[PDB]
Design a protein around this ligand. Structure first.
Ligand code: NA
Length: 129
């Protein structure tokens, strides 16, 4: 599913991302825009052989199991494919674990390069929240 900007904001807010570990909702929306273009089905292969899954491009080397990333972990205890659903629950739950891991939202390269330090509140302007 390809979310609209405010639909996803609302969905994120209902699943408790809003100010999670001190990151305001706009950060999360901005990160999803640049990582996946709001598409729960996006996948991207990495040079190391791992794959990034879903709206928040969560990586198979540490967080979910794809059966094809040797020696990898599965800290979120979920098959990666589950992160691709129309229901973002599982992605949000795994994202909470990532952002708590010590580097905050910097674990998302595109947040760091395209959202950090910008007026992230723009991403929720106009939305009935
Ligand atoms: Na894995």
């Amino acid at each position: 599913k390809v979310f609209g900007r405010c639909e996803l904001a609302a969905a994120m807010k209902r699943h408790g991302l809003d100010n999670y570990r001190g990151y305001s909702l706009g950060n999360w929306v901005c990160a999803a825009k640049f990582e996946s273009n709001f598409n729960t089905q996006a996948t991207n292969r990495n040079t190391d052989g791992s794959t990034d899954y879903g709206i928040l491009q969560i990586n198979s080397r540490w967080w979910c199991n794809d059966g094809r990333t040797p020696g990898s972990r599965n800290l979120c205890n979920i098959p990666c494919s589950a992160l691709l659903s129309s229901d973002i629950t599982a992605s949000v739950n795994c994202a909470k674990k990532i952002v708590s891991d010590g580097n905050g939202m910097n674990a998302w390269v595109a947040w760091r390069n395209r959202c950090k330090g910008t007026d992230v509140q723009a991403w929720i302007r106009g939305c009935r929240l």
